Symmetry: C2
């Protein structure tokens, strides 16, 4: 029964999607919290923060949904 087999596969993939969404969003949230820390401490010429800002750049929201 192909329909039954596919329904089981759908249920499993849905759980996987829910889990991955949470994981993605949790890591993204960490990146955003770190971006905030950098933005707050902006213009104090800390070279390590500059390193971190440069890493952060590609993870910016504007590359996912235009802002």
């Amino acid at each position: 029964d192909e329909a039954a087999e596919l329904m089981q596969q759908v249920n499993v993939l849905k759980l996987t999607v829910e889990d991955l969404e949470k994981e993605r969003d949790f890591y993204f949230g960490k990146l955003r919290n770190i971006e905030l820390i950098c933005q707050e401490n902006e213009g104090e010429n800390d070279p390590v923060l500059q390193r971190i800002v440069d890493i952060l750049y590609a993870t910016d929201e504007g590359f996912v949904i235009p802002d």
Copy 2:
């Protein structure tokens, strides 16, 4: 046709898994890059890096 409908749903959910997983991995890798920078600069007693370390390991 339930089987055909479900098959399309599987295809979409596989693509969704792929997209979410790749995104998760990319964000993880970036966090790990930041982690290393923090580790390398530990014992400088930089309070901003302490803030960042605390975010990294928050649950």
